[PDB]
Amino acid sequence: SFVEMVDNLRGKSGQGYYVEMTVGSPPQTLNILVDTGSSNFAVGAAPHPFLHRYYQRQLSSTYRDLRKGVYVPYTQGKWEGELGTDLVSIPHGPNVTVRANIAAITESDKFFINGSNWEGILGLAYAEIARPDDSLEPFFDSLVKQTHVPNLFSLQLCGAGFPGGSMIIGGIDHSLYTGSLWYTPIRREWYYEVIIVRVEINGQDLKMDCKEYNYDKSIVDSGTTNLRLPKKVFEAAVKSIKAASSTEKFPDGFWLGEQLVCWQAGTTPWNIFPVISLYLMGEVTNQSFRITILPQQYLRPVEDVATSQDDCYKFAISQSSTGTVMGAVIMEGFYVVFDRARKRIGFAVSACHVHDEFRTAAVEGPFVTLDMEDCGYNI
Ligand SMILES: Cc1cc(C#N)cnc1C(=O)Nc1ccc(F)c([C@]2(C)CO[C@@](C)(C(F)(F)F)C(N)=N2)c1
Numbered sequence: 433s434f435v436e437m438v439d440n441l442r443g444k445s446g447q448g449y450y451v452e453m454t455v456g457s458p459p460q461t462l463n464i465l466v467d468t469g470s471s472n473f474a475v476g477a478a479p480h481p482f483l484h485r486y487y488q489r490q491l492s493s494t495y496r497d498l499r500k501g502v503y504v505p506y507t508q509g510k511w512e513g514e515l516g517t518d519l520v521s522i523p524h525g526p527n528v529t530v531r532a533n534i535a536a537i538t539e540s541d542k543f544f545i546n547g548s549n550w551e552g553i554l555g556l557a558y559a560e561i562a563r564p565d566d567s568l569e570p571f572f573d574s575l576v577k578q579t580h581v582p583n584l585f586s587l588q589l590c591g592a593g594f595p596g597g598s599m600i601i602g603g604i605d606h607s608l609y610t611g612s613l614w615y616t617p618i619r620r621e622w623y624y625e626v627i628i629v630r631v632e633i634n635g636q637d638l639k640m641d642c643k644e645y646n647y648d649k650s651i652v653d654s655g656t657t658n659l660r661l662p663k664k665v666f667e668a669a670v671k672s673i674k675a676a677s678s679t680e681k682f683p684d685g686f687w688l689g690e691q692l693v694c695w696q697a698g699t700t701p702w703n704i705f706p707v708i709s710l711y712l713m714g715e716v717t718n719q720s721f722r723i724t725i726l727p728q729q730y731l732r733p734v735e736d737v738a739t740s741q742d743d744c745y746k747f748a749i750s751q752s753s754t755g756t757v758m759g760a761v762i763m764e765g766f767y768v769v770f771d772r773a774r775k776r777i778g779f780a781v782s783a784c785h786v787h788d789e790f791r792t793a794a795v796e797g798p799f800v801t802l803d804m805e806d807c808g809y810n811i
Contacts, residue, residue, distance in 0.1 A: 434605040440524035441466065441589070441597040442549070445735050446657055446746075449589055449760070450550040451599055454521045455534060456492030461485075461523075465553045466587065466599055468624055468770065469653030469757070471562040472504070473520070473571045474513060475552030477536030482544040483551055489536060494519050502535055504563045509542035520571070526601050530578040532571045535563075553655070556585070556770070560622035572772075575601075583773040587654060590784035591764045592735065593728060597784075609767035609780035614721040614797050616712040618775045619808060623651040626777060627713035628756060629720045629807045630799075631665065633672040634706030640665065642807035649755040649809065652768065652777060656759030658689070659708075659730060660752035669708070669749060676706040686747055692734060694744035702727050702788055710758070713807065714798060715776065721797025723779050728786040729761045729793065755809075765793040 442463075443449040450463040455475060462475060462485065476486040489495045498515040513535040521529040537543075537552075544551075559566040559573065569577075576583045581602040588598040588608045598608060619625040628645040631638045647662045661669060670687050680701060683691040695701065705727035711720040732748035748761045765785035769778030785793045 434600050434603060437525055437600050438598045438605065438608070439596060440522075441599055443589075443596065444547070444549065445592050445733055447545060447548045448550060449597055449654065451525065451554070452523055453554070454523060455487055456489070456518050457494040459519075459521065460487060460492070462487065462552055463550045465550045465655060466556065467553050467653075467655030468556045468587070469651060469655040470553065470555035471557045471559060471570045472535050472553070472555045472568070473532060474504070474511065474535035474537055474555070476540070476544065477513065478538045480540065480544055482546045482548070484549070485551055487534070487536060487552070489516065489518075492518055498533075502564050506543070509540070511537045511540035511543045513537040515568070522601070525599065526575075526579065526581050528575075528579045528581065530575050532574040533568055557623055558621040584769065584771050586767060586769045586778075587763060588767050588782050588784065589654065589760055589763045590782070591729070591786065592733060594765065594786055595784040604769055604778075607783070609782050611781050611795065612797075613767070613769065613778045613780040614795050615715050615769075615771070615776040615778045616721070617715060618777060621775070623649065623653070624770060624777060625649050625651050627807050628710055629713050629801065630709075630711035630722075631669075632709040632711075632722075633669060634676060635709075636672065638665070638668050638672075640668070642805060643809050645756060646807055646809045647755060650758070651755065652758045652763070654760055654763060656757045657732070657761060658748045658750045658757070658759050659725070659762050660750050660757035660759065662756060663751055663753070665756070666749070666751040673706055677704045679704055689747045689750050692739070692744040692746060694739065694742035697741070697743050700731075700743050700745070703790065705731065707791060710762075711799060712779070716798070718801045718804060719798045720801065721779070721795060722799065723762075723766065724794040724796070725762060726786050726788075726791055726793055728788070729764055732761055766795065
């Protein structure tokens, strides 16, 4: 039941949200990163300094070796692994066990993070971006094929500042959101690709050709921390935010997201930072809705006992060369419905949405645009 699935996520700020899963027979329990930006189920399967535990295939009598290898290099990190299948379950998810592909990670470089408390990644996106190729069926596909679970899941990611989170598989849980749920089309089933049609910073339109917002794609990715923007859009956003907060002086490389800024506890000047509104393509022609992002989201609190006399933050907006990424800081405070069955993504204000006495995160619509341009970058 959905009530059983509530609060089945944990996380440390800036380290990722993970769910408990089991693999093998008898079941071996692991914490697994929930990642809508990739499509492999990959788990550490050998000793590593940053792993508290790992998948031991020899102890599973249901493991099947596919006798095939896979190498997955990422921007900074990388891992090598062997492909196989085994029985998989989510103890606080749907009441089922399925057989699924598993990439058993035997070597890795800068992939596992010290202190993250997760031991693998659950890629929830589509087969088209699975490694080594689209023939390796992703977990969620296996789940839907082998069970009667509806082809839909939802994420409620909660920041540390507001009430962790929930992954609900198979349906929508209404106690997890207030107001209307607004849907934007999934443009293409590989990443969860969507279309941004307009960007405002404190109510001021950036006035760019809307294709620029979706160079070279725009995705929803729980496995990315920041809001990531194409160079042109990033520059316009930083300029606008800088202008609004000009009464205060920021450390040199703060806008590069390298450097912390701190204020005396409780004194963070939230009101001098603008809200960001992202207008997403609606289900009806030239209609859209907007999600509004507060500084409480895009100024990310960095938890470190050593700096804990103050409140310190990193700038959680960064420049991208591979398109817009609406990462965790964006998803936080919203209930996000990945409605694969109807090829759409829903947004609503979640129970743990961010706000202060003056402003609040919001999902609002419909808005109508006169211009009939297709905002997609690639047909
Ligand atoms: C610190 C952290 C904080 C939060 C928050 N809040 C969420 N996730 C992490 C994290 O560790 N993520 C992570 C680690 C290793 C990886 F190999 C990947 C991959 C498979 C590849 O990289 C991307 C980003 C993509 F493909 F887009 F490039 C992706 N989505 N998944 C992700």
